[model samples]
Target: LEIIGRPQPGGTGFQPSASPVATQIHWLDGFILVIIAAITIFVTLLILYAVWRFHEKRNKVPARFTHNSPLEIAWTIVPIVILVAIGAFSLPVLFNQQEIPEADVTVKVTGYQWYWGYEYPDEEISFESYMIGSPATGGDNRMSPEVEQQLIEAGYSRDEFLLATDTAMVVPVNKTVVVQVTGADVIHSWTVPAFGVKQDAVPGRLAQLWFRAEREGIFFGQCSELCGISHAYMPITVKVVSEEAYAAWLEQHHHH
Candidate 1:
């Protein structure tokens, strides 16, 4: 589903995971939540029982038992087993997200103080994406009419106002995209929630993450790190298209 990676207004859980890594993340989140809920309920009930059974009016003298060896061992061993079980399910997902696969495409994302620049090394294309409007210019944080028209012409919906950009980072569906991230000026974070990928764009350091979209759609994110005054305006938009469409886009931008 195209909406799998896009945010919904009243969403309770994660936006549906669209990539393999994201799917694993979803599963881990659910698993952890279940474990946490069970533990919470058990602990709460135990505390309630203790308060009722050991009250001052009910018990004039406290029990003289200092420790119980079997109970202590059970608590220790049960926690270890639960932790081991959690690790068994969680470690692989971490490794899968970190180990970059053979990239079907590679893009370099450089974060500036208030904007983003993307470069496709193999395609010989590069572009800087800026927010459409600014408060100082007396414009709301929305795409200008001309910019909105351009995006509409390119098959994007109008509701993608602040999230849309004049130029988008385009990739093909079902293909591994290795994104190399760095900061031009200060530290910034590139995050896409639905794809379950986030990496810091540290100054003078390069970090990377990968994603493979299972469906075609336009997904949006923003610079998560607070770099400067306009940090909130640096939105990230990605257009995932068919391979043929990606080729057409590459050809169209080849000479630019």
Candidate 2:
């Protein structure tokens, strides 16, 4: 029941990695960054020392390069060893992304025009998600006064306009969600940064990405590429609700 899921303004870091795979990816990112920091500091010091120690004032004629010696072998093998070690540490994360688990809920997302349509195959709920002020709300690319009213009515703030969608794709918290995303037009994309899951939606061939959000809040994601002129008009909003609440919604939606 974590209350944080949306992007932070002037965000310090990633939107609190909310999924299991997201946490793993976050750690991997930190690992590489930490190693790079250490390496940069060490190299900078060595570079500064080399410039001061081996200047023309220190030595009139500097010693020539080695043909094949200790420094040569070390400089050659050390970077190779570091790269190989990093490769060993990073491969598992990539594999984890490829391995898909048995999904509790599966949704097929179709990218048409510039918006997204999500169909819950088993739940029988289907809806097209568009930006808050796009075609669904009488928008012509400019933020009008009516859109501001619509945002408040839809439980969203004014600033979250471009990234907020009309209908959100809902799922129960802590349940496996697999999205089979494909584009009917050119290639589009589906992603939620908090979950650290992105899958390119190519035409014809269906691709899948999975995640289980541990929080109950709204997370927003924008389409990846500039598919057309209305690229930024498409926003992906996911509402992670509780298990009981999700079932209640399903039951009520069935009646209506």
User: Which lDDT tens digits does candidate 1 get at residues 177-247?
Assistant: 99999999999998777688999999999898999988887777889899988788887878889999999
Candidate 2 structure quality by residue, lDDT tens digits, 92-197: 8889887899999999999877899999889788878888889777886558798888888888878778888888888899999999999998888888988999
| Local distance difference test values of all predictions, in order | 0.83, 0.86
Off by over 4 Å in 1: 1-4, 134-159
Pairs in clash, predicted candidate 1: none
Off by over 4 Å in 2: 1-3, 66-68
Structural RMSD, model 2? 2.0
Top lDDT hit = 2
Candidate 2 global CA lDDT score? 0.86
> How does model 1 fare in lDDT?
0.83
